[PDB]
């Protein structure tokens, strides 16, 4: 009697995979003040379970109105739990892959990187740029696919750049220095230096600097959300989550991650 799951599903091997997928968003001042930050998250499940399994998902945070999650929406299969009703939900899942819930958090976010900019005018013909990035997570974890984008003014005539890790180039048509790093461990720093030559191009006003933007991926959930339990029970087939191959992953990525310069 379940609209989203047929009867008779059978798998040789019962498996349940869960990905906590998060985008961390930040606006930060040149001096490191958090002006705004939030996480937008979703939980994607891949269910290869026989029969009509009854599943219970509990987290460390209150996800049903231990920080609270500002807002949360749930797949149609999700029901409120009679017990631990603020941190957990219950459901018979659809078969295969589906999105179990989406959410937003704003408090106690782990900011994986700090960008520290230095953009000093030298006369009217030159900008000296140094940007330091600091990774703020466990040293045994690696961020990957890191990109830093540093804007240049429209009167830019030339750029010289040297990065200490990864690779960088000036994309003149985009007025940006693009700095890419394949991997970086936690509690590290790296930096890039550039000299930007400017045309006189007087008769204009001051340069309204876009922020420095970052992209990255991190192997954790910046919200701090943690799965406390993932229960499965099928009384007719008589198996439970300890007969199921389970896998819980936490995957973080930048959303809009911007630092004023």
For residues 119 and 129, the answer to whether their CB atoms sit within 8 Å is: yes
Q: How was this structure determined?
A: X-ray
User: What is the rounded distance in angstroms from the CA atom of residue 93 to the CA atom of residue 4?
Assistant: 8
**CA–CA gap between residue 70 and residue 104 (Å, rounded):** 6
Q: What single string gives the DSSP state of each residue in the chain?
A: --TT--S----SS-EEEEEEEEEEEEEE-TT--EEEEEEEEEEEEEEE-SS--EEEEEESSB----PBPSEEEE-TT-EE-SSSTTTEEEE-PPSEEEEEEEEEE-SS----EEEEEEEEEETTTEEEEEEEEEE-S-TT-EEEEEEEEEE--TTEEEEEEEESSSEEEEEGGGTEEEEEEEEEESS-EEEEEEEEEE----SS----PPPEEEEEEESS-TT---EEEEEEEETTTTEEGGGSEEEEEEEEEEEEEEE--
Maximum Cα interatomic distance, the chain, rounded to a whole number of Å? 80
Task: Write 241-247 long-range contacts (CB < 8 A, 24+).
Answer: 241/16, 243/14, 244/14, 244/15, 244/16, 244/49, 245/13, 245/14, 245/15, 245/16, 246/15, 246/16, 246/17, 246/18, 247/15, 247/16, 247/17, 247/18
Q: Establish whether 188 is an annotated binding residue.
A: no
Q: Domain map of the chain by residue range? A: 1-110+218-256, 111-217+257-259
Q: Round to whole Å and give the CA distance between 185 and 172.
A: 30
User: 192 with 168: CB under 8 angstroms?
Assistant: yes
For the chain, how big is the Rg over CA atoms in Å? 24
Contact between 60 and 12 under an 8 Å Cβ cutoff? The reply is no
Alpha-carbon distance 88 to 66, whole Å?
A: 12
233 burial type by CB count under 10 A (0-12 exposed, 13-18 middle, 19+ buried): middle
CB 63 within 8 A of CB 90: no
Q: How far apart are the first and last CA of the chain?
A: 58
Work out whether strand 96-105 and strand 34-48 pair parallel, antiparallel, or are unpaired.
antiparallel
The encoded tokens of residue 89 equal: 């939900």
Phi, psi of 42 (to 5 degrees): -150, 155
**Is 246 annotated as belonging to a binding site?**
no
Token pair listed for 95:
């078969």
At CA 134, angle to CA 133 and CA 139, rounded to 5? 140
Question: What's the resolution in A?
Answer: 1.9
Cα–Cα distance measured from residue 122 to residue 260, given in angstroms and rounded to the nearest whole number: 20
Cα–Cα dist 148/193, whole Å: 12
Give the integer Cα–Cα distance in Å for 21 and 31.
Answer: 29
The answer on whether 126 is annotated among ligand-binding residues is no
């Amino acid at each position: 009697q379940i609209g989203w799951r047929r009867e008779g599903i059978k798998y040789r091997r019962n498996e349940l995979f869960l990905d906590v997928l998060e985008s961390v968003n930040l606006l930060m001042s040149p001096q490191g003040q958090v002006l705004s930050a939030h996480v937008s998250g979703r939980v994607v499940m891949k269910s290869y379970l026989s029969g009509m399994p009854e599943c219970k998902f509990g987290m460390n945070d209150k996800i049903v109105i231990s920080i609270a999650i500002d807002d949360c929406t749930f797949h149609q299969c999700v029901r409120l739990s009679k017990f631990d009703s603020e941190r957990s939900i219950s459901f018979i899942p659809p078969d295969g892959e589906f999105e179990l819930m989406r959410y937003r958090t704003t408090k106690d976010i782990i900011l994986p990187f700090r960008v520290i900019p230095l953009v000093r005018e030298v006369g009217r013909t030159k900008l000296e740029v140094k940007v330091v990035i600091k990774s703020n997570f466990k040293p045994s974890l690696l961020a990957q696919k890191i990109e830093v984008r540093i804007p240049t003014p429209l009167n830019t005539s030339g750029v010289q750049v040297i990065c200490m890790k990864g690779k960088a180039k000036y994309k003149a048509s985009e007025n940006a220095i693009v700095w890419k790093i394949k991997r970086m461990a936690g509690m590290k720093e790296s930096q890039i230096s550039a000299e930007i030559e400017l045309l006189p191009t007087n008769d204009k006003k001051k340069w309204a600097r876009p922020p420095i933007s970052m992209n990255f991926e991190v192997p954790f959930a910046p919200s701090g959300l943690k799965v406390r339990y993932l229960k499965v029970f099928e009384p007719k087939l008589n198996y439970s989550d300890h007969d199921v191959i389970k896998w819980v992953r936490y995957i973080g990525r930048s959303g809009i991650y911007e630092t004023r310069c």
